[PDB]
Amino acid sequence: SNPVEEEAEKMTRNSWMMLDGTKTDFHITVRNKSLSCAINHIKIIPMNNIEQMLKPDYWKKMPPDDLYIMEKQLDWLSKSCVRIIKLITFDLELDNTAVPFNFTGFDLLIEYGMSATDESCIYLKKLSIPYEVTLRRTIEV
Amino acid sequence: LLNMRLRNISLKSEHCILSSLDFQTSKASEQLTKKFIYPQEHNSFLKLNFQEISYKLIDGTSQIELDPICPLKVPLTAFSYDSISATFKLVLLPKSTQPHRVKITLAYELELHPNLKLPVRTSWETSLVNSKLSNVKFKFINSNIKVIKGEKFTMRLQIINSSSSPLDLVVYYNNTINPITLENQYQLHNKYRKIAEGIILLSNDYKIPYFADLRFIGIMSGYYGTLSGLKVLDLNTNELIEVGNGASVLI
Numbered sequence: 118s119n120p121v122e123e124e125a126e127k128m129t130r131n132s133w134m135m136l137d138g139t140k141t142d143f144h145i146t147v148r149n150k151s152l153s154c155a156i157n158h159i160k161i162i163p164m165n166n167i168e169q170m171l172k173p174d175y176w177k178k179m180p181p182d183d184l185y186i187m188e189k190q191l192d193w194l195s196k197s198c199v200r201i202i203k204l205i206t207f208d209l210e211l212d213n214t215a216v217p218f219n220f221t222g223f224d225l226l227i228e229y230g231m232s233a234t235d236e237s238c239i240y241l242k243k244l245s246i247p248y249e250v251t252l253r254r255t256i257e258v
Numbered sequence: 259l260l261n262m263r264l265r266n267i268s269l270k271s272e273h274c275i276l277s278s279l280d281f282q283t284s285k286a287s288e289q290l291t292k293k294f295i296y297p298q299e300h301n302s303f304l305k306l307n308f309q310e311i312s313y314k315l316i317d318g319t320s321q322i323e324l325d326p327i328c329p330l331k332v333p334l335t336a337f338s339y340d341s342i343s344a345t346f347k348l349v350l351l352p353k354s355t356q357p358h359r360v361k362i363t364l365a366y367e368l369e370l371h372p373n374l375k376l377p378v379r380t381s382w383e384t385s386l387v388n389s390k391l392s393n394v395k396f397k398f399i400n401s402n403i404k405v406i407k408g409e410k411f412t413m414r415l416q417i418i419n420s421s422s423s424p425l426d427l428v429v430y431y432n433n434t435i436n437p438i439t440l441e442n443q444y445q446l447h448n449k450y451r452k453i454a455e456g457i458i459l460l461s462n463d464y465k466i467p468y469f470a471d472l473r474f475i476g477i478m479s480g481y482y483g484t485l486s487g488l489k490v491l492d493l494n495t496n497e498l499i500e501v502g503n504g505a506s507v508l509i
Contacts, residue, residue: 130416130469143344150316206344253469 125149126235126242128249131216133256140210140246147232147242154208155234162213163198163226171220194223201231201241216252225249260287260305260372261360267343267382275345277380279312279356280338288334302333304363312341313355315377321354331363343380351381385503391494394419396501399469404506406476410460413504415470425467427492431459452478453486456508479508 126148129136145151170193179185200210212228225248233241262284267277291303308329313320323341330337343352357375364370386397399414415429436450456478464470483505489498 150314150319152319 124238124240126233126238126240128251129214130251130253131214132253133216133219135217136214138212138214138248140212141206141208142210142246143206144244145205145207145232148234151205153205154202156203157209158200158202159209160211160213161198161200162215163196163228164213164215164218166193166196166198167219167223171218196223196226196228198226198228199230200228201243202234204234204236214248214250219252221252221254223252260284260291261374263356263358263374263376265354265356265378265380267380269345269383271345272385273345275343276340277343277354277382278338278340280336281307281310281358282336283332283334285334298365304331304333306331306361306363306369307337307359308361309357309359310339311355311357312339313357315353315355331361351379353377353379387499387501387503389497389499391497392420394492396490396503398501398504401504404504406506406508408476408479408508410473410475411506412471412473415472415501417466417468417470419468423493427490427497428463428465429459429461429470429472429488429490430463431457431487432489433458433487452480453482456480456482457485457487459488476506476508481505481507 129138143151148155170190174186174190177186198212207230210230212226214226227245227247229243229245231241231243235241262282263279264282265277265279267275270276288303295301295303306329310327311320312323321341323339325339327339346352355375355377358373360372360374362370362372385401386395388395395418397416397418399416404411404413433454435447435454438446438450457474457476460473460475461471464472484502485504485506486500486502488501490501491498
């Protein structure tokens with residue numbers, strides 16, 4: 118047998134406009150039992166996944182049936198932006214959920230943060246945070 | 259057996275949990291050393307508290323108490339510092355450490371050094387308004403936040419349904435004095451008069467068919483806790499249920 122040492126390592130409804138969020142959560146026992154933060158993350162805006170999905174899917178405009186986007190976009194029916202913090206509660210974590218460029222049949226952003234201050238450990242205990250939101254559409258042409 | 263210590267924890271449910279330790283002078287120990295102190299011509303003790311610290315008991319952790327503290331020394335007294343916990347959801351009783359350092363004193367020397375640490379669990383443990391029929395939960399999206407100044411304002415009754423016939427009901431305010439130990443008659447009359455006459459609800463039988471705005475104007479002052487009157491009514495016989503929630507100072 119060969120072991121080694123055990124290491125010491127809200128459903129918002131935004132109506133097609135800008136918004137905000139705030140996250141200060143004490144699910145951060147991943148280095149020395151939730152002492153403090155490694156380094157900050159001052160209000161990271163999440164709208165870039167659905168920007169670079171909702172732009173080129175309707176800028177496909179090649180033959181759309183052969184699916185050069187060949188993998189299924191069932192995991193792109195949410196957003197799941199990420200904030201992997203560097204080497205108590207969550208110090209700074211805000212996100213401007215801007216629905217002003219968004220689809221009409223999506224639900225959430227399962228936002229996963231790699232909580233560890235673990236220098237190249239390949240170990241980082243990533244805890245995910247959901248939203249389970251709903252969109253009330255205001256206008257169509 | 260020189261300074262009796264106790265920790266009291268109060269559960270503020272709309273915030274963090276608050277727990278305060280409390281030092282005291284332990285009189286059944288003070289008359290002991292008072293006898294030998296007035297034998298050596300001294301009236302009261304001079305115990306010096308030089309390092310007082312509460313640490314979050316874990317594998318290893320520590321906290322910091324929620325105001326400032328110097329390095330103090332008192333004769334026959336009691337002190338009590340407060341440190342904020344984190345309000346747990348269910349079933350995790352946290353523990354703390356609470357170390358201290360009493361330094362006794364004598365004639366400019368002979369400071370008999372003492373130290374103490376009593377580690378224990380910091381769990382004393384003694385706004386959604388549900389429909390109570392079919393989980394049609396209501397919550398104001400800005401409850402208990404309103405400093406109006408006898409101006410108009412708008413609120414947000416975010417109704418959360420079963421999404422099964424979601425268009426059913428109507429709000430109203432009932433500006434009528436309810437018809438009710440003689441000063442127990444008068445306090446109930448002043449409560450029922452200031453409830454039913456102080457605010458107006460400019461959208462009266464608004465007939466909501468899942469947000470709302472509900473503009474009020476509010477023509478008298480005073481802290482209106484719990485905002486009574488603002489009833490709803492639904493498709494069945496009498497779902498006359500309250501909101502029971504939200505408050506507004508009007509000055």
